Amino acid sequence: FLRSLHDDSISSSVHPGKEDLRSLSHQQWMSMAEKVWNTHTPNHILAALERLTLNSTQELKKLQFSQAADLSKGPSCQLKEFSEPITQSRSCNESTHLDPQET
Amino acid sequence: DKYLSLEEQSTAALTSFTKEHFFEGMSKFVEGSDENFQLVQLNVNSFGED
């Protein structure tokens, strides 16, 4: 929901009618959030939030290491041919034809 | 408490990331200076040999 608000703020396209849908989404979350607090104990919710937070931190570190590795590999490295067609590579797509990225 | 401390750690991790990737040359100087974290005005100019 927040992301959607963000993307809109950035894209300046105030489509007239989007407010009804926003309110609904907001209400939907409110109901869900309320349900979460009715169904589970506060102790367990906070514990869950702690874990989510740790996960989020670990993801950031991984991203730091991966981006550092991409900067040090300036190109001598030879195209090693590794084989199995296992991963689809679809990701959010599929996409990466581009790397002509010749220097 | 414990939760807010974890979030602080997460924020710290985010801060380190933003420094390294948006502010190109700084890894060398992070060690010594303890105190007053004043927001050193990152003069962009130096890099390009060219």
Curated annotation (Swiss-Prot), chain B:
Superkingdom of the source species: Eukaryota
The cellular location(s) given in this protein's UniProt record come to: Cytoplasm, Cytoskeleton, Microtubule organizing center, Centrosome; Cytoplasm, Cytoskeleton, Spindle
Q: What does this protein do?
A: Contributes to mitotic spindle assembly, maintenance of centrosome integrity and completion of cytokinesis as part of the HAUS augmin-like complex.
Family listed: Belongs to the HAUS3 family.
Q: How does it assemble?
A: Component of the HAUS augmin-like complex. The complex interacts with the gamma-tubulin ring complex and this interaction is required for spindle assembly.
Q: What is this protein called?
A: HAUS augmin-like complex subunit 3
Q: Give the organism the record lists.
A: Xenopus laevis (African clawed frog)
Q: Which gene encodes it?
A: haus3
Give from-to of the shown chain within the full protein. 200 to 249 of 597
